[PDB]
Design a protein around this ligand. Structure first.
Ligand code: ZN
Lengths: 124, 99, 104, 138, 208, 83
RNA sequence: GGCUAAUCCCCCAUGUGGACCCGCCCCUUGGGGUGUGUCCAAAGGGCUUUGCCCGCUUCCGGAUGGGCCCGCGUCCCAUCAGCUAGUUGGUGGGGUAAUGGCCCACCAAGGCGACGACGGGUAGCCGGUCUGAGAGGAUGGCCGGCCACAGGGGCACUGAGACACGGGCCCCACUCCUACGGGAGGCAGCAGUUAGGAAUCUUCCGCAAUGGGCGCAAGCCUGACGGAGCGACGCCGCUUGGAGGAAGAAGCCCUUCGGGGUGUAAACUCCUGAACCCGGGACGAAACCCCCGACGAGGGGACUGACGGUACCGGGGUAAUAGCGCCGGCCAACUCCGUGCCAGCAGCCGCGGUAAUACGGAGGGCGCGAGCGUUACCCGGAUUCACUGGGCGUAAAGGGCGUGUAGGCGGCCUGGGGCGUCCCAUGUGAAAGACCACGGCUCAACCGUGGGGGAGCGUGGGAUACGCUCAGGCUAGACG
């Protein structure tokens, strides 16, 4: 484009679309569960994943992923969300903070404790 | 929950009245001196203007008339007079008028 | 220093007041070429002397009317409509390019 | 229409050397001459003289090259390796003295045009002036 | 947590002898003696070609681990070494060698670096007359780094200086054993350092 | 009524003042008119007070009541010594 | 309803002077001089009481602080294109400190818009700050400057100043008292309460310091402020030890079963000695005041700390926290077992269907260390909005073609002007920050002090190639 063009028109600055509607730029947000399914993977990988419906304080109905060898999230349990889409699980843009609220941390974890919300197992 | 920092209001009233009785004083006298020049009372017109010019500068002495405020007042009255007295020349006294 | 500008009287419909077209040139803040912008300042002619197509100098003055903070200083060059025409045609073109109705 | 004279000049020069001409004609002018004064003065070109080209005044710019290379394709190191109008019409770029650019770690040059004369970077900086930065040659 | 753990494990990972214990890292055993292979189950295994980062990495580490400083301070030094006029690398080393603790090492008042820090944090080190317990203290040139009057009669320091009759002191430093003192003459130059490092690799590392 | 006073600039327990000239109505830590020397309570340096009387006298001349403490410092400077 | 003082108020005289009209002289928008006429002043109190202090009045000047006004700069949408009736201008009048449609009356028909009017959306602005090689992008809390509101809207009073967060009048919504007529309230001050939320503190100390109001002063007020407390929320400093110590214990892992590994690691040897204990114990603070001296200068005397018995010095003194991420590639770190497209990991590519360096534990290893990870968000990588620094035959991209409007851009020589443009001098560009240097607190974080730099704009001076402009001349473009 000619320098004149660049003047009459100017350069269009690229706008960023937030892959996260947690309304606020809040890192987390609480919500009560509704339905807790077992969605099936995408194309390559197959298995049975644990997922949950969560109604947020911001007022958005979303699908959150629950990590760990298995949880204990009942029908109307309160939980916490951090966000991180799951490649092979479509529509799942968020995640659950394990260990906060009425959501528990995995049992028998002896590794990546920082995540999963377990606790330092007192050796003996 | 009382505050002795309301006496100011308790006092503002006294001044409100105060200023009021002075300004309205002017307004009236000016509006009196003015109607006189219409009829052509070259004697008493200046007799009243004088009572005006006095009141005015007296309000500037206090807090009533801002300062330059008084000045406007004076210019607006004398100029309004003289022009009228063109309908019937000759100022008898020559009080509030230099010539 | 009271600002002084130079321009052309483009409007002569007003009482004692004249519209002045004032052209300004300057390098663009990022693209560097010299862009030429402009503005109309309402001047103030007491004696109704300055006429259309006259180039005058403007000088910052005591406020006079809402939007008329300049008095006319002197005349620069009388007799130059060529400039005014430009102002006029651009105005005319403005009658077009809308959503009322286009024709020929 | 010819829109930019100098660019056409510079560009006649580039386009020549590339095909290795002994000389190249170019319409003449009291400025294009001043620029060419430098190219010779610096050493990018042998030189130039006024020539009557069909009644019209031209400048024969005498190109310069390097020696014949060895191995294959002995096309001689070009003396004028690079040359381009910096400032173009509709985008004139003027520069302050503190702002005159160093070229090729100082190896090339920069031809400006000051209120004091058509200059090189070195000369410009020496004179304490700056202006219309004409072109980069190196 | 300013480290403190298994030491000649690092003498091992780097392949270069790291004088971290003074005596002993001289007796058939800084471990590098007779066991140069790195730690772990995989020490005796064939080592694949180290990626560019890899080499830059270990070369940074070798330096850091030598003075035994927390990356946090190491980084900070490098940062401030870049704001100074001079060679972004040699100037680094300069400051590094300007540390109170380190100086006590070179001055010989301590068996090793580690031992030097303690000597300071327990206050056995005078500086221009006043004690000092902060090792991160940067010694300026022409400072009288000494020993605590109180600490002169020490079973340790005493046995150390006795060794200094025979060893030459860093060219940029002076010391009066007879009086357990010593000065900092000037910032030592790269040509005056013996380190087995390659500054360039350390600098390169910080531009990723 | 423009005064001449101090201004905090040290830090928590490290008070370092600024003898300055400014309108009464402004803050302590506010935009001053013309700084004229500094004062350090603790006096960590041999050079713990400076004034430049030349300017200090300008102001008082013009009309600028200084502080009780401020005046004190100016006196040490020799702002008023008519010998 | 009645009394009564005053530095409250009002009258009268004096007038240095000052105000207004009118005239003139100078200037030059409402600046200054001047003449006649007219109008305007004022409080007293205290002592060391025949003089000194405080306060009072008019006027010119100063200083500081501020009103109004102008040039330039100032986000996104054109799926917002025409907007405007006090609206634009004029005369007179009002009103103000004062210019002004600010307001009113009459007159006129204007004023703005693609150089984006109007409409919508969003957002206090800046010094600075984050990032970035830079340009640029992002930001504007803490500190500083400017602005705006002080439950929502309206209004004015008093005053140097307010349209006035803890003053007032009215309406509205809410909450509370109520004899149901009628009232009382405004923490966006400090602390705190509750609600909302992922999430943000003590109803602390002190008025010693610095500042501020009032006071002749003693002094009073001062949740301004100086301090403490709580939060690993950040940063910086500090520790959990140092030296010796096997061809190498045990246990745990690996094995080609011979051995390797954890590992100088431990144990054990000695040395030092945070914590902890006793003692001493702070600068910050010297004034106002008082005395001498002349309530001047100069000099002498007194009082007075929240922090805090804290920092800090002396002496003695125990070996005395470690965790978290990661180990398929990017990316430093590899084995066994469990498992078997399951359970699960996962930023991306992907991993897992009986041989998994990618799941889960374990040994081992790497990285960092009172921290480590995670998610969110900004800049960066991204020259992937491209000024620097991009593109359009087929990758996404030439308008279906022409016409020509506004605009952009434009040939050779000569001269004038010198607007752009370049050089010089000068004012400005507060402070804090950044930078360099010196110093302060055992270091550093933090802080002080000094130096240097700068774009932008104002004024003055200069240059004239190149752009612009005016003039004159040409013929190579164009046209005939
Ligand atoms: Zn060793």
């Amino acid at each position: 484009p000619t320098i004149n063009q660049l003047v009459r028109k100017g350069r269009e600055k690229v706008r960023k679309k937030s892959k996260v509607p947690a309304l606020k730029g809040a890192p987390f947000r609480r919500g009560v569960c509704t339905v807790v399914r077992t969605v099936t993977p995408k194309k390559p990988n197959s298995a049975l994943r644990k997922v949950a419906k969560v109604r947020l304080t911001s007022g958005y109905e979303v699908t959150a992923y629950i990590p760990g060898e298995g949880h204990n999230l009942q029908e109307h349990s309160v939980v916490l969300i951090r966000g991180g889409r799951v490649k092979d699980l479509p529509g799942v843009r968020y995640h659950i903070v394990r260990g906060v609220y009425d959501a528990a941390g995995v049992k028998d974890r002896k590794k990546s404790r920082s995540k999963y919300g377990t606790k330092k197992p007192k050796e003996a | 929950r009382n505050l002795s920092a309301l006496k100011r209001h308790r006092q503002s009233l006294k001044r409100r009245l105060r200023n009021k009785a002075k300004k309205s004083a002017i307004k009236t006298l000016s509006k009196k001196a003015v109607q006189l020049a219409q009829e052509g009372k070259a004697e008493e017109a200046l007799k009243i203007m004088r009572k005006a010019e006095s009141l005015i500068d007296k309000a500037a002495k206090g807090s009533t008339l801002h300062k330059n405020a008084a000045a406007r007042r004076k210019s607006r009255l004398m100029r309004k007079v003289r022009q009228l007295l063109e309908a019937a020349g000759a100022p008898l006294i020559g009080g509030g008028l230099s010539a | 220093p009271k600002k002084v500008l130079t321009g052309v009287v483009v409007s002569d419909k007003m009482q004692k007041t004249v519209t002045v077209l004032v052209e300004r040139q300057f390098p663009h803040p990022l693209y560097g070429k010299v862009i030429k912008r402009s503005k109309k300042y309402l001047a103030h002619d007491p004696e109704e002397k300055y006429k259309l197509g006259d180039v005058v100098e403007i000088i910052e003055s005591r406020p006079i009317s809402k939007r008329k903070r300049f008095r006319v200083l002197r005349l620069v060059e009388s007799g130059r409509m060529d400039l005014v025409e430009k102002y006029l045609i651009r105005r005319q073109n403005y009658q077009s390019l809308s959503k009322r109705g286009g024709k020929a | 229409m010819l829109t930019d004279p100098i660019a056409d000049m510079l560009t006649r020069i580039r386009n020549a050397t590339r095909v290795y001409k002994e000389s190249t004609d170019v319409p003449a002018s009291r400025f294009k001459e001043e620029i060419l004064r430098i190219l010779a003065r610096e050493g990018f070109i042998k030189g130039y003289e006024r020539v009557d080209v069909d009644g019209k005044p031209y400048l024969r710019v005498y190109l310069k090259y390097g020696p014949r290379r060895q191995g294959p394709d002995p096309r001689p190191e070009q003396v004028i390796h690079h040359i381009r109008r910096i400032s173009k019409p509709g985008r004139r770029v003027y520069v302050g003295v503190k702002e005159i650019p160093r070229v090729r770690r100082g190896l090339g040059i920069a031809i400006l045009s000051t209120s004091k004369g058509v200059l090189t970077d070195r000369e410009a900086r020496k004179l304490g002036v700056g202006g219309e930065l004409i072109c980069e040659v190196w | 947590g300013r480290y403190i753990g298994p030491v000649c494990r690092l003498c091992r990972r780097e392949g270069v002898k790291l004088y971290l214990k003074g005596e002993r890292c001289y007796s058939p055993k800084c471990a590098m003696e007779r066991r140069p292979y790195p730690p772990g189950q995989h020490g005796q295994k064939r080592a694949r070609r180290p990626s560019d980062y890899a080499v830059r990495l270990r070369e940074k580490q070798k330096l850091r681990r030598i003075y035994g400083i927390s990356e946090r301070q190491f980084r900070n030094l490098f940062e401030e070494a870049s704001k100074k006029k001079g060679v972004t690398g040699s100037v680094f080393l300069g400051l590094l060698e300007s540390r109170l603790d380190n100086v006590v090492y070179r001055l010989g008042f301590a068996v090793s670096r580690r031992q030097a820090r303690q000597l300071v944090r327990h206050g056995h080190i005078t500086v221009n007359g006043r004690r000092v317990d902060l090792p991160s203290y940067r010694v300026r040139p022409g400072d009288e780094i000494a020993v605590a009057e109180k600490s002169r009669n020490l079973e340790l320091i005493r046995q150390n200086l006795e060794a200094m009759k025979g060893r030459k002191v860093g060219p940029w430093l002076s010391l009066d054993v007879e009086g357990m003192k010593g000065k900092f003459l000037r910032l030592p130059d790269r040509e005056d350092l013996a380190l087995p490092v390659n500054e360039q690799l350390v600098i390169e590392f910080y531009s990723r | 009524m423009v005064k001449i006073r101090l201004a905090r600039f040290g830090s928590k327990h490290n008070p370092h003042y600024r003898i300055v000239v400014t309108d009464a109505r402004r803050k302590r830590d506010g935009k001053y008119i013309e700084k004229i020397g500094y004062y350090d309570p603790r006096k960590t340096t041999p050079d713990w007070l400076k004034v430049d009387v030349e300017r200090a006298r300008y102001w008082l001349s013009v009309g600028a009541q200084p502080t009780d403490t401020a005046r004190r410092l100016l006196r040490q400077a020799g702002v008023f010594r008519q010998e």
